[PDB]
Amino acid sequence: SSNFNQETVTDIHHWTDTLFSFRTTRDPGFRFQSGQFIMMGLEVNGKPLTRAYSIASSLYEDGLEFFSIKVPNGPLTSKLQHLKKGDQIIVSKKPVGTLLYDNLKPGKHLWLLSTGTGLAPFLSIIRDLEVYERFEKVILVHGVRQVAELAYTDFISNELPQDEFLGEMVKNQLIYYPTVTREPYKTRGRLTDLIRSGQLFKDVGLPEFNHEDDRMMLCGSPEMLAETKQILEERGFTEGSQSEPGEFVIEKAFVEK
Ligand SMILES: Cc1cc2nc3c(=O)[nH]c(=O)nc-3n(C[C@H](O)[C@H](O)[C@H](O)COP(=O)(O)OP(=O)(O)OC[C@H]3O[C@@H](n4cnc5c(N)ncnc54)[C@H](O)[C@@H]3O)c2cc1C
């Protein structure tokens, strides 16, 4: 420790028995780029117990936010799930990751394709002025299994458009496309199935992906990332990196341990 900032919990919200969000203080020195992750967790017997977490908060916010799984036997989240306001967490000081605008070639459309907690980095990006300066449209796809897992659905649809700074850009440029596999909902099925049938493009009112206009960031389950990568690679889209801008970038929302 002392390669960590101590932050205090300010707010906690449980979406379901497996998903919760919380907000903390943010150190004055803590700088990041929208889409980056850090190591977050708890001081346990005077040593760090930390996991990779996407920063879900805006870089414009005087606070941090995390959108977290709750795993009953998971070493970190078995404890993290019981957090209360005024509890302390630790956050590493060196943000990293691939979900960055400069890893993509300039374009017209940015598709943020997520499952489950993979929404987290995109909650930072849709609350960044810079994404709306760079992209005419931002399409946020969030795929989940149950309606109650659509964390932030009322925030994104109703509260974000009234944001005093970003409200008008979100109204004009953000298209939010939630989908639910295992419960009745206006939009059903896996985002991979919705690309393959063309229903994604019909429903959001934009053309089929093309090499000129469309860029993607992928953050989701190992199955969704493998299937969506193959879809995009076989259509002739290239994976970006710091060393060579591309049309799409990938980050694991988690690893099957
Ligand atoms: C780059 C990166 C970014 C990440 N960002 C986040 C984030 O923003 N929010 C988040 O909750 N986790 C995130 N994770 C996963 C995270 O690092 C931990 O795995 C998670 O905190 C649970 O840790 P644990 O010690 O309780 O259980 P672990 O021992 O890490 O995992 C136990 C099992 O739970 C499942 N699991 C773990 N994380 C998830 C998850 N997010 N969704 C579904 N199943 C999961 C897997 O089946 C895993 O095999 C990220 C991982 C990576 C590699």
Element (H, E) at 16: none
Amino acid 2 reads S
CA angle (166 as vertex; 53, 23 as ends), nearest 5: 30
Q: Is 152 left (phi over 0), alpha (psi -120 to 50) or beta?
A: left
Cβ atoms of 72 and 192 within 8 Å: the answer is no
**Residue with structure tokens 């920063």?**
55
**Residue with structure tokens 């017209």?**
108
CA gyration radius, the chain: 18
Q: Which residues pair with residue 51 across a beta bridge? A: 40
Q: Measure 204 CA to ligand 1 centroid, in angstroms.
A: 30
| Distance (Å, whole) CA 57 – CA 254 | 19
Ligand 1 atom 15, closest CA: 254
- Residue 23 sits at φ, ψ, to 5 deg, of -115, 150
- Probe residue for ligand 1, chosen from 69, 80, 122, 251 as the CB with the greatest number of ligand atoms within 8 Å: 69
Question: Annotated binding residues for NADP(+), as ranges?
Answer: 144-145, 181-182, 190, 227
* Strands of the 214-220 sheet, one edge to the other: 174-180, 137-144, 109-115, 214-220, 248-252
Q: Measure 69 CA to ligand 1 centroid, in angstroms.
A: 7
- Probe residue for ligand 1, chosen from 17, 24, 71 as the CB with the greatest number of ligand atoms within 8 Å: 71
Ligand 1 atom 28, closest CA: 74
* Strands of the 88-92 sheet, one edge to the other: 47-54, 37-44, 88-92, 4-14, 19-24, 64-69
Cβ atoms of 68 and 20 within 8 Å: the answer is yes
> What is the full DSSP assignment across 151-164?
TTHHIIIIIGGG-T
* DSSP-H helix ranges across 62-166: 77-80, 120-125, 129-134, 153-154
In terms of Cβ atoms closer than 10 Å to its own Cβ (0-12, 13-18, 19+), residue 156 is buried
| 246 secondary structure, DSSP code | B
Experimentally determined by: X-ray
Cα-Cα-Cα-Cα dihedral of 25, 164, 204, 14, to 10°?
A: 30
Q: Is residue 252 in contact with ligand 1, taking CB distance under 6 Å?
A: yes
Cβ atoms of 18 and 3 within 8 Å: the answer is no
In terms of Cβ atoms closer than 10 Å to its own Cβ (0-12, 13-18, 19+), residue 187 is middle
257 Cα nearest atom in ligand 1: 49
Question: Annotated binding residues for FAD, as ranges?
Answer: 51, 53-54, 67, 69, 76-77, 117, 255-257
Amino acid 18 reads T
Ligand 1 atom 37, closest CA: 254
* CA dihedral for 236, 241, 244, 249, sign (positive or negative): positive
Provide the 10 A C-beta neighbour count for residue 239: 17
Q: Is residue 68 in contact with ligand 1, taking CB distance under 6 Å?
A: yes
Closest C-alpha among 177, 187, 136, 150 to residue 67: 150
Provide the 10 A C-beta neighbour count for residue 117: 25
CA angle (126 as vertex; 166, 153 as ends), nearest 5: 100
Q: Measure 161 CA to ligand 1 centroid, in angstroms.
A: 30
Closest C-alpha among 232, 20, 230, 6 to residue 120: 20
**Residue with structure tokens 């919990």?**
9
Cβ atoms of 113 and 175 within 8 Å: the answer is no
Give the resolution value in Å.
1.7
- All structural domains of the chain, each given as residue ranges with its CATH number in brackets, are 1-96 (2.40.30.10), 97-257 (3.40.50.80)
Cβ atoms of 124 and 96 within 8 Å: the answer is no
| 84 secondary structure, DSSP code | -
66 Cα nearest atom in ligand 1: 8
